[PDB]
Amino acid sequence: EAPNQALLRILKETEFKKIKVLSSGTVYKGLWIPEGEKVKIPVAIKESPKANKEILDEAYVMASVDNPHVCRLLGICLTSTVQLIMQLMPFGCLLDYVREHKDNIGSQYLLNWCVQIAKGMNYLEDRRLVHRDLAARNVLVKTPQHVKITDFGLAKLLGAEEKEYHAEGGKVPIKWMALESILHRIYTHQSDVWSYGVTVWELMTFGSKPYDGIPASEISSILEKGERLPQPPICTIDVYMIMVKCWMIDADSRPKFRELIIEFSKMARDPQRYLVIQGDDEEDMDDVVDADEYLI
Amino acid sequence: EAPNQALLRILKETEFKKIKVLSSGTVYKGLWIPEGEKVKIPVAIKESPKANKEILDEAYVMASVDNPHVCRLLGICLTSTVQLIMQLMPFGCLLDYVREHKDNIGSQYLLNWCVQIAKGMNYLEDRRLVHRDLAARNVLVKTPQHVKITDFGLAKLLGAEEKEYHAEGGKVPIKWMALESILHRIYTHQSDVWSYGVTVWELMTFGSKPYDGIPASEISSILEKGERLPQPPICTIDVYMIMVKCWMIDADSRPKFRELIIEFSKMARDPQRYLVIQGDDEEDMDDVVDADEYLI
């Protein structure tokens, strides 16, 4: 049980300019010009008071994690409307990218993505943190060969000698959820593995919707009768076998993020043995530095 | 809206002897020998007529509060110069103690202090009283493990169905003050929470001066641009996150004294997970009784 000495940097709204609306709470593309530092950092700005407790728990989790495959918070801004300042991921979330480039994505990208998401999830294991909302919609694309886990709205830090997180009520994404989570609201790192399983499936199917046209009220019944999502077209049995293991009912039986890194990594060395696919800014951009190069 | 049946005990100056000057109005160390009661109570004696209205409003507030973490008035003395008789806090105020023992104070003390000040502030919520001058200089140390809130010069009792106290003019300690208080002279229990935030910061920094070398005229501007006090060295992010919430702009968004007790309490159970610190009378003293044991 070690002390968490992450820094939370508070920013002035004078130091950053919004530019466009990425979404609509309400994310903006922007540029952050710190202190007096001859650098301009491209940022995404997330702009009650239930919403405030929520958004500062998120800030807390996000500040205390540091990994190349995990979303980077640059700071907050304590304006009336609280603001999260994050690294800009120009290519948006992975669900969309995969849908918008369905026709042009190869084995090599797909597998490396499975690797990079496992690396991020393993780091979250190490930090004893449990994401609880892993899905392709919650992976961001920095560049097409570099993705990051994001959206820690539901993330929970595991306590001392505590291995489960019993949830209360609350709206939850059922179709990504493990069975123990859905019946008993228990959440573990293994639980997160189940969702990994479905995230991989979103990717292999180029962005299909798990259990399309089915009731979330049904899902639990299905899972228990022993149904799972079907084998995508693109998938060697080697790959599908890995998803299926993520959906084992005995959570301890599933693979650890550690092993998933190793497995997808071996595969990414000979991508086409494992997936069978047909076809295999602006302004004064001079002091621009990406968040990854802006440390402190 | 219930009747306030506090007692105000009037004392003869014949019943108490001054001994030394604690400060220079003009506080004295002294001993109070009541009635005919075989007890000697160590007291601090605070010795126009603007000053008199002021000092009897203080007496009023102080008489009507009763908590282990709130300064205890023993009575007044209606001599030409009006006198407040209080419990003696031998170790003086907390700002000084923390400065004078900078090098020797641990996580455990610091956190328990944050707890005891929250307990006192919550009691003041219950009694519908608003302190308006909370700061480390206005906490007294009875023993190093037992502190009390003091100085009710500015305290105001909230009325019937009244939730704010609009102030008039008057000199005010800006650097401890909430933003709504400073722009609009509004004061709430939440407002007091902001000051708690800074009181905690005084303690974590071992007695630094908030916003050193800055103009009180600036402060308001800063707070609004979204700057706050920086994260002290000693502080887990867990602790700092709590201060920052106390300085939220939407007062309703800040934590209640209730929650602050709970939070600091959890932390005081494993002090070093949360703070990272290097090094973690006289005469016939026979009928001496401390004020806390002198009831009526």
From Swiss-Prot, chains A, B:
Changing residue 13 to A: Found in a lung cancer sample; more sensitive to gefitinib than wild-type. Ubiquitously expressed. Isoform 2 is also expressed in ovarian cancers. The modification Phosphotyrosine is found at residues 165, 294. ATP binds at residues 22-27, 46, 86-87, 151. Changing residue 130 to L: Found in a lung cancer sample. Changing residue 35 to K: Found in a lung cancer sample. Changing residue 270 to A: Strongly reduced phosphorylation. This is Epidermal growth factor receptor.
